[PDB]
């Protein structure tokens, strides 16, 4: 009876911007990954550290579901060791990522005539992210040496710029909804498996 709330994260309603990438832990639960193979509606489905055909019968100490919205070009950067605008200042995977990466198109739902501006991303950060770090600050990026003083000014940018999401866009600049499932291998009891 206790399915892992997967329609809660996948089917869902609102997703987060990638700078404020949303995360759900699911403890004490059996997980139906069967409804994720036989789907076909995923454009990319990558799995790092484990085959997903194996996934219905290992035991893990928790799984985290990370989820967000990015352009279709930026999905590649949702991978171990990818360089990039999303990987560095928005959402970094560890290089030793056990887990999987699931993404699909959402123009019929997220791309609005006139421009759905409502999703956005970090253009500018001082340091890169640590894996699974989350950055929320609206602190003005000091792009030059001339200081910023909290004002959007000379060499001083608001570090978050928008996605402008028209449904008329190219295959690159679409809106995509991504779900990252990570699997921690703790030296600890299993709370989530599936048989």
């Amino acid at each position: 009876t206790n399915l892992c709330p997967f329609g809660e994260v996948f089917n869902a309603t609102t997703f987060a911007s990638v700078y404020a990438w949303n995360r759900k832990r699911i403890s004490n639960c059996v997980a139906d990954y069967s409804v994720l193979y036989n789907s076909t509606s995923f454009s990319t489905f990558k799995c790092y550290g484990v085959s997903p055909t194996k996934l219905n019968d290992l035991c893990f100490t928790n799984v985290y579901a990370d989820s967000f919205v990015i352009t279709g070009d930026e999905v590649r950067q949702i991978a171990p060791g990818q360089t990039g605008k999303i990987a560095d200042y928005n959402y970094k995977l560890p290089d030793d990522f056990t887990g999987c990466v699931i993404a699909w198109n959402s123009k019929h739902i997220d791309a609005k005539e006139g421009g759905n501006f409502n999703y956005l991303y970090r253009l500018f950060r001082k340091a890169n992210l640590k894996p699974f770090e989350r950055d929320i600050s609206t602190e003005i990026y000091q792009a030059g040496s001339k200081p910023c003083n909290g004002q959007t000014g000379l060499n001083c940018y608001y570090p978050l710029y928008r996605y402008g999401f028209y449904p008329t866009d190219g295959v690159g600049h679409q809106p995509y909804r991504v779900v990252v499932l990570s699997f921690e291998l703790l030296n600890a009891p299993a709370t989530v498996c599936g048989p």
Partner: antibody
Amino acid sequence: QLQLQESGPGLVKPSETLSLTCTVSGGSISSSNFYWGWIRQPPGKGLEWIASITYSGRTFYNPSLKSRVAISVDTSKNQFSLKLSSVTAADTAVYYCARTFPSYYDRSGYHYLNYGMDVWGQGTTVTVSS
Amino acid sequence: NFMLTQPHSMSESPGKTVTISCTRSSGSIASNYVQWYQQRPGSSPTTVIYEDNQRPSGVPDRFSGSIDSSSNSASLTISGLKTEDEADYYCQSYDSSSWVFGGGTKLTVLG
């Protein structure tokens, strides 16, 4: 980021064993998501792959070379090594250590691994001369 | 195993679109991933196209890679050609026995 700096003798008198080492910074070589390779470039000629290795020991080889090729992960000092033996003039080349794209599985479960190079070294030069 | 044959030399005007082909001699081209690398002279290579049509980051949007199953070719497309693209372009594909590189396409920008 991910910097890749080679270590070579520059000189390998012939019929001997050439050792290169690829020092890695900004990333775990112990990660089993990636593979780690050597590409050589003999001078003014094209590129060929030598061998690739992941940390599990699972290891792929160019078969025209595989007889003379050995490779290993020096995981304490975060670096990996090419050992090529019984070299000749045809082993004069710029040797590039590189890092592949991440090994993954599709939703059908087919394993994609060691298929192409993401990040490159600067290269090191090996001249084989007596 | 298989060969990957690239034309040795191409020349095209600035701003125009050039396409480097990459013809697998043996086996269908859509069964293995195709990578494209650029080499400026005396420089290390860098990856411009991996997984047939993806780019790593910092590769401009004017780089695209495509596949033709009819001619059994992978194509690399540079559209809006610069002064600065003048490079050796190697296509690489693999299988689980060996990798194969092409021989090199030395690209030259005219004008």
